[PDB]
From Swiss-Prot, chain A:
Entry EC no(s): 4.1.2.40
GO molecular function: 6-deoxy-6-sulfofructose-1-phosphate aldolase activity; tagatose-6-phosphate kinase activity; tagatose-bisphosphate aldolase activity
GO BP: 6-sulfoquinovose(1-) catabolic process; D-tagatose 6-phosphate catabolic process; lactose catabolic process via tagatose-6-phosphate
Gene responsible for this protein: lacD2
Keywords on record: Lactose metabolism, Lyase
Family assignment from sequence similarity: Belongs to the aldolase LacD family.
Pathway(s) annotated for this protein in UniProt: Carbohydrate metabolism; D-tagatose 6-phosphate degradation; D-glyceraldehyde 3-phosphate and glycerone phosphate from D-tagatose 6-phosphate: step 2/2
HAMAP family (UniProt xref): LacD
Reaction(s) the record says it catalyses: D-tagatofuranose 1,6-bisphosphate = D-glyceraldehyde 3-phosphate + dihydroxyacetone phosphate
Annotated protein name in UniProt: Tagatose 1,6-diphosphate aldolase 2
EC category: lyase
């Protein structure tokens, strides 16, 4: 169930069947991060520059890098020759006044254009509430079907990122949401693992908020280590596709411990698409110090970060070739 | 160019001996505008669905295929002649008249896969296009059509792209001012969307002239000689090697027929029609004012006469897409 060219592209995005990909398609989120030191709005040059510094210096240690076509094409051209390229296809964000969080592709892009821009994968982010409005989810399923069809035609892997939410729960970090997160994550993965959607890799959240798991929690506890472990097994059971974890609302150190726990519990996850934590500090150094200092930062603290992550992946991730 | 095995079989189911004699009734906004002329209340779902089912049942025995919309036309699709193929529209009807961009938008709960699953032998999509218009608008439009063309390649189903031209700065398509640029708008738009990257299998296009302003056809101001108009058809033939078929644009049945004759005499090797209002227009007033049965009798007499006389003209004017 993988064409010759999709297989070749998958291999360019991984090392020995493990995806160790660097996520840096942030647009508005990165922009705000940037305005936290300088005065005056951040220029398009700064957005594209730091993306090129991070890409040039850290992709030698990542199997691939996820970039956005709007700001990231220059960064994409200075990436390491041994690192694949994924390009984001979705517009960022969502309308906070509505609960539908409907998906929308970038206006002047298509899967064909993403492939022409050098990408080895189309990445699209979908917000999904399995329990939400039935017609909203019908429109969302139709939308992904189109993108899956596009990616089949262009013979390019389709990486579908799913971020769960609840139309009623405002705060995804609340204990209230944590009680349903396993239901949201795993049922969404079941939906979009159906063949009609054409997905090659699922980029998903871990099916639990570890900050409420015993031994990992700084405060209130809602789950035993055994209840959390079963969520990871339920997740493994929810899809036969390769899937990789994103890092959300946790520290670098907790994310790594989570990878250990995930593997311990029996999850056969196939890697990560992690970003902010690795190139975090470079954002402040870049605005304040000279870009030559952000370089040395990336060559030292930057390398240390992604290297320690790689050492953990080597003992937790499973190769997607097993599937 | 080439057709996959499945795409060719679908094209065969839409055609007879390589000629597309297709009946178009995916009208929605245009249909509601017609029904509104004949009654006070607003048209109901049941009225739209029924009138489409009547045209389908009564006239598809005389067509090689029928084009319907998924919103109101699926019941009509199920009563078409056993011998007739099916195309389904994929675009939302109409455009925003408060801006000049007329951006395309797919039906929200449909996809090429779902159109195929609904029994269609082709996906039809209408695009409003002004070759001379805003360049960023047109880049967005071109990207959109690339997506649809890719979907149809993946689902292995013919892509029928309809192009209706306009000018961002000319309000009335029927005016002499627009008539003077129409050939440019049509022919260059056909040249763009014949590029391989758009995955089009058949173009549904306007004739590249407003015949009401051509010598011999014009009742008022004459803007073009016959040789000038004929050259516009030759330019159109030279703007693509894809199959293309003409839409009627709601002219009279007689004018559309005479335009097809003129097109063939001029050198256009067009491959058929997707003809709607020129065939069934008069049934709307009858259906509204007199009801379903009276509309059946109109379709069986005047409606039949329009499509039969059209079929006779196609037999002596259209060129086959197979023999290329
Ligand atoms: Ca630890
Ligand atoms: Ca060509
Ligand atoms: Ca030609």
């Amino acid at each position: 169930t993988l064409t010759e060219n999709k297989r070749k592209s998958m291999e360019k995005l991984s090392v020995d069947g493990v995806i160790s990909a660097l996520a840096f398609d942030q647009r508005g989120a990165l922009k705000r991060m940037m305005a936290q030191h300088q005065t005056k709005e951040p220029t398009v040059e700064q957005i594209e520059e730091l993306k090129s510094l991070v890409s040039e210096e850290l992709t030698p240690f990542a199997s691939s890098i996820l970039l956005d076509p709007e700001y990231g094409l220059p960064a994409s051209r200075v990436r390491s020759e041994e690192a694949g390229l994924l390009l984001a296809y979705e517009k960022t964000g969502y309308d906070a006044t509505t609960t539908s969080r409907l998906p929308d592709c970038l206006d002047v892009w298509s899967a064909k254009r993403i492939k022409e821009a050098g990408a080895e994968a189309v990445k699209f982010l979908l917000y999904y509430d399995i329990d939400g409005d039935q017609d909203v989810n019908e429109q969302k399923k139709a939308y992904i079907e189109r993108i899956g069809s596009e990616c089949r035609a262009e013979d390019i892997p389709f990486y579908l990122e799913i971020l769960t939410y609840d139309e009623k729960i405002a705060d995804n970090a609340s204990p209230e949401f944590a009680k349903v997160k396993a239901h949201k994550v795993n049922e969404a993965m079941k939906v979009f693992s159906k063949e009609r959607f054409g997905v090659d890799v699922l980029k998903v959240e871990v099916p639990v908020n570890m900050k409420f798991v015993e031994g990992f929690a700084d405060g209130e506890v809602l789950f035993t280590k055994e209840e959390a472990a079963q969520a990871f097994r339920d997740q493994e059971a929810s899809t036969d596709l390769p899937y990789i974890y994103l890092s959300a609302g946790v520290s670098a150190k907790l994310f790594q411990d989570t990878l250990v726990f995930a593997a311990e519990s029996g999850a056969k996850f196939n890697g990560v698409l992690c970003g902010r934590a690795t190139w975090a500090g470079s954002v402040k150094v870049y605005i304040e110090e000279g870009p030559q200092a952000a370089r040395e930062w990336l060559r030292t603290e930057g390398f240390k970060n992604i290297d320690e992550l790689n050492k953990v992946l080597d003992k937790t991730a499973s190769p997607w070739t097993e599937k």
